[PDB]
Design a protein around this ligand. Structure first.
Ligand code: COA
Ligand code: COA
Ligand code: CL
Ligand code: CL
Lengths: 225, 463, 463, 226
């Protein structure tokens, strides 16, 4: 069961899931994520990079590293095996010397319209789902909508239409309309995760990329309590 | 859990009534008798043999009867003892007028009050409240006004002074009341419990709530209950702390943490609740919702003897997402039988400033009788060609003779004669207002509720 | 372009008065006499020897006198003939009541009317108007109400039926009027010309305008004039066609193209004008601005006998960009001399629900006398421990004894006694309202005008 | 006088200014523009590219060619003679196969920044009116704009900037410095003056305008005549 990830985290006194664990968990709820695998060696990756498909992004996985980039724990646009051997040894090299679980091999995410899907716990209303457009639209303008879980289809659709930036989803200069049904589906499932898993205090799906067909969560945080 | 015997008790005790007619307990007892309670009333006082002609007792447990409700009006340092005695007496509800609990920082005393009540299977209203009124039981257990107009509106207030003032204000605004409930600190019984009762109450058709907040962990149930109630009865919430700054301020008055503005709003939408930003808006909407059926379609007609009032109406509706469409040709033809050629039929229908009184009769009658008309807002600008009361009575006659019921609101502009005409209409339970924007906002509340109800229905759709 | 002798004429003619008292001309003549015009009044009728006890003439040019103003109430097919005669008689202003011009598609007739007036150096008001009133000249040349309350508000209306009704409504809302001007089709004289007169008029302190649109090429001068007026006198505009949909509706009613909503709004901002979305708001704001000086700083105090009214106030102010700050320690100390320990001094100052009448006197007096207080909103929720009229009298006494002038608004909530108390306050020119939100919105208009004036001042800064 | 551009255009029955003429005009009012030159020959283009400084953008200029990229009349980041002769030869080629040409516009490179739009329109009631908004989706998709009737005071310019919902894009955010608000105010006022003073200008578009921590630059401009 995916609950094993939460149980293991709790027994080890962790207050969050590691990146791959978070991706696995939300995937098990039917929310599409960037394809990932965990490498316990430089060679274990070749089957996985091959399987996943180049170019693959590499990320260090360690309870220690809250920020992956400052330590030098990230490597982007790796387009071949030789390029994995290099980006792999470099990240081992780098983080070790900065900080003495494995390497995450992650698929490339084609550009699209970025979204955020949140889950928080309100003192009065309990698990609550948050939606907004990515980038400046949430971070700078704070354009978000909320619905208390569980979400109906009516809740998901209306909370999407309610944000000021909504038109970024229905086609504009050099960008096709994106899959709104797939967004609604993910919102509802995010609410279900909150309702069902009491040990999840908070969850962040950020960034989520929406395409003309389907969506993909690129990064996800799950906070425990 | 069942509040049937709170609102319709066989026996009520008033603990803390006194020979001194000025004390709160005595004021409550006086209202109970004045308003005409038909059950048994038991004044409770340590020394008095009788109060206001009724046999008095020193303890509720001395009463040779089963007391349903004890209204407690003794100081906070005496409340817990009374609670134990009421518990022993088997009392179901403790209506705790008394102040001096969580609202002044004595959170522990308040929690002990509830803990103690519950150990006897007893529920608590309040504390820190001005009581409650239930019209169908001729029950006025408040120290507020002695009387209210009878009707189908239940008003729940978390505020004290404003709540008791609003109780009086309902009379001036001609709002018929089924119940007034002061909930105050809301330490036990709350909005959810009350909504459950009013849901089943055939006497209550509209619920208005002055609300600051609800207790932690209570929100999910609030939405669950409120949404189902909204399927049949509109809920209007006057939210205290609508803004970030207001939310911070109101929270410290209640001795609580400030709730999320955005999430409350979302909860209200998911509940089908209408959020009012002001007393006037709440009362205006409550009036219309109390006295009208919900529109069954978008075919709203505006009738006016002037383009200007009509434009104010159009702008106001537009602000509420309501847009007018061309009237039915049948309606236009009917009205052309008496209207000048230079009248306008774009909707609003402008019957021009030359319109005498009976044109309001005929126009209103034609609109309401037309099968493709769902709602009517009637606008009147006083001229020398008309009498305001004449216009009002024409509207009344048209409504009666339409032999149906569609939502109607009326806006009349003018001097003292318009003021009296508006009053006349409202005392006939026809929602009337002294400006076209207020009449249009009132009708807008009817459509907002229809859409709110539709939101809830869609959200409950089966997969 | 000087309107001195329009508003203060020596002689007025009424063309189209009749033996028949029911005709428009006769109604206007009756109001002129009734309201007490002291100049010469010349009824003009083809056959009558005298009307209303005054020698009548068949033509204005037959009058042995210089007629300043001709109020023309004959059918459209006879207006131009009357204009030529008035031109020959040298009349300066033609007040053309008559309808049937541009508003019904007769653009050519309307343009001919103006060109012909101008060929005699004559100006035109309207056509398609209900006349005008000027209180300081005891001149009621309308067929509206015979009387208004005297005061310093000038009301200009582009609407007819709504305008004449609003004229009556001012009485009900206790608004003192210096002038009523119906401008109707606005074919010649318009808002810019009128604003120029009211600018220089010492009898007028506030200008309220019901405005649908202004003529092409007139907007720049409108801003130029209005902005300068706003330096000393507030202008409130009730805009018809605030919304896209409303703009189209009102435009085709006037027989014109629909103007840009966004650009009109910018023009109002550049003019220091306050735009009202409703009659109620406009009247509520006009009252406060008419009876109060503008606040000289941000130090606004709210006084309340209940946290709930205070929170409604806080939210409403916040909605208007007005934020309260802590009261001066001196004020807090003054009030602590009579207030209970559990009162709240965060601003609003909560003197608690136990507050008797005289606490409103003392609290108000202390606030208004404090040098670090710029404005005061007093809120009152009726309970049995107070009398609404008592509270009102206390506020009145506090203001008088404060021996100064700071802006004050009052919000009182309660039953019939509060209605009477509010009336009492308003008849003494203390801006009072039946809800805390309306009192707070009214005070917000005082600050809105201060900020608008400041916009204009900075806008006129020299490089 | 720069008015000669307007007079010449009208005399030749044109209903707008060509890009180089428009840029010259607004520059003459003190509004900063991309340095430009008009190519009077394929060889004249390199001489200007040299003078202006690489990298240079190249643009087709013709009364007929209403469109930019669709026709194929544009080329960015050309850093040499060879790269100019190549991009020029196509520029004759590309646009024709998709129309008398005034010439080829050689334009200096515009470093990226925060894009703005400054508009000038004529309102039937209020006459010349200045429009402001953030570029990209913010005007085109969201219609986030502000208006002030000309002439503009400094108070008008500043307030109309702060009034747009996208305003915060001008005051520093993730990976972008605050931009020169004063330079924006100055350009708005001057746009208003252009409208007030030049009655034969029906409407004007400064789009895109790029704002930097110091100063601004108009990258493209339309001026419509009447
Ligand atoms: C509840 C409250 C009104 C009582 O104040 P009070 O009337 O001055 O208090 P008292 O001490 O006089 O008690 C009332 C009576 O109850 C009697 N009493 C006291 N303890 C009693 C007991 N255990 N059983 C029965 N009677 C009792 C007292 O003897 C007195 O009667 P008396 O005149 O014969 O002596 C007061 O404490 C309070 O809370 N006031 C504010 C309430 C409020 O504002 N609520 C919210 C409105 S929004
Ligand atoms: C102006 C208007 C009221 C005139 O209609 P009316 O009074 O019924 O018309 P009449 O033909 O009866 O003319 C009125 C009087 O003027 C007289 N009259 C006509 N032409 C005249 C002239 N050239 N000189 C002098 N008197 C003249 C008529 O004889 C009549 O008097 P009488 O009763 O003694 O015969 C009408 O045409 C109109 O426009 N009504 C709408 C006004 C309105 O609502 N305006 C907007 C307000 S919001
Ligand atoms: Cl009207
Ligand atoms: Cl209160």
């Amino acid at each position: 069961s995916s609950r094993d990830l939460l149980l293991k985290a709790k027994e080890n006194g962790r207050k969050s899931l590691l990146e791959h664990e978070a991706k696995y968990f939300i995937s098990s709820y039917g929310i599409p994520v960037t394809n990932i695998r965990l490498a316990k060696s430089e060679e274990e990756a070749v089957n996985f990079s091959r399987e996943i498909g180049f170019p693959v992004v590499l990320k260090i996985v360690s309870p220690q590293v809250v920020h992956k980039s400052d330590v030098g724990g990230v490597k982007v646009n790796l387009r071949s095996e030789e390029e994995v051997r290099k980006a792999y040894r470099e990240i081992i090299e780098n983080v070790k010397r900065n900080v003495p679980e494995g390497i995450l091999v992650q698929e490339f995410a084609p550009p699209g319209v970025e979204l955020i899907i949140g889950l928080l716990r309100d003192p009065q209303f309990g698990p609550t789902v948050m939606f907004g457009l990515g980038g400046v639209f949430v971070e700078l303008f704070r354009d978000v909508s909320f619905r208390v879980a569980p979400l109906s289809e009516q809740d998901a659709e209306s909370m999407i239409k309610e944000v000021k930036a909504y038109k970024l989803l229905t086609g504009f200069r050099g960008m096709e309309p994106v899959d709104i049904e797939a967004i609604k589906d993910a919102l509802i499932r995010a609410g279900r995760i909150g309702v069902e898993n009491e040990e999840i205090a908070e969850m962040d799906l950020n960034p989520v990329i929406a395409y003309p067909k389907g969506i993909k969560v690129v990064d996800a945080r799950i906070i425990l309590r | 859990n069942d509040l049937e015997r709170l609102f319709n008790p066989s026996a009520i005790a008033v603990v803390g009534a006194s020979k001194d007619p000025s004390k709160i307990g005595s004021q409550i007892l006086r209202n109970l008798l004045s308003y005409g309670f038909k059950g048994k009333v038991y004044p409770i006082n340590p020394t008095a043999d009788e109060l206001m002609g009724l046999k008095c007792y020193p303890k509720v447990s001395d009463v040779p009867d089963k007391v349903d409700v004890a209204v407690i009006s003794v100081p906070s340092d005496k409340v817990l003892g009374v609670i134990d005695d009421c518990g022993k007496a088997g009392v179901k509800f403790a209506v705790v007028i008394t102040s001096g609990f969580k609202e002044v920082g004595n959170e522990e005393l308040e929690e002990e009050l509830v803990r103690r009540a519950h150990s006897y299977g007893m529920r608590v209203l309040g504390p820190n409240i001005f009581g409650y009124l239930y019209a169908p039981a001729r029950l006025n257990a408040t120290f507020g006004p002695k009387d209210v107009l009878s009707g189908n509106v239940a008003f729940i207030s978390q505020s004290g002074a404003l709540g008791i003032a609003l109780m009086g204000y309902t009379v001036v605004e001609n709002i018929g009341i089924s119940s007034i409930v002061s909930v105050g600190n809301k330490a036990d019984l709350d909005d959810v419990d009350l909504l459950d009762f009013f849901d089943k109450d055939p006497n209550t058709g509209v619920i208005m709530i002055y609300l600051e907040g609800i207790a932690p962990g209570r929100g999910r149930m609030f939405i669950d209950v409120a949404s189902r109630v909204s399927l049949r009865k509109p809920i209007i919430v006057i939210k205290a702390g609508r803004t970030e700054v207001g939310a911070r301020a109101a929270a410290s008055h209640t001795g609580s943490i400030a709730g999320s503005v955005a999430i409350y709003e979302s909860a209200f939408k998911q509940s089908g609740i209408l959020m009012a930003k002001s007393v006037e808006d709440a009362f205006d909407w409550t009036k219309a919702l109390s006295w009208n059926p919900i529109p069954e379609g978008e075919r709203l007609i505006v009738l006016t003897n002037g383009g200007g009032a009509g434009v104010q109406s159009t702008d106001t509706f537009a602000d509420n997402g309501i847009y007018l469409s061309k009237p039915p040709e049948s309606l236009i033809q009917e009205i052309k039988k008496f209207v000048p050629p230079f009248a306008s039929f774009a909707n609003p229908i402008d019957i021009t400033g030359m319109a005498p009184d009976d044109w309001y009769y005929m126009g209103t009658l034609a609109a309401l009788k037309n099968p493709d008309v769902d709602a009517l807002t009637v606008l009147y600008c006083q001229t020398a060609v008309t009498t305001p009361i004449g216009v009002a009575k024409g509207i009344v006659d048209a409504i009666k003779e339409a032999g149906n019921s569609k939502p109607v609101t009326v806006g009349m502009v003018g001097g003292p004669e318009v003021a009296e005409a508006v009053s006349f209409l409202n005392k006939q339970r026809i929602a009337a207002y002294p400006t076209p924007e207020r009449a249009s906002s009132a009708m807008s509340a009817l459509y907002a509720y229809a859409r709110a109800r539709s939101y809830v229905m869609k959200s409950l759709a089966v997969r």
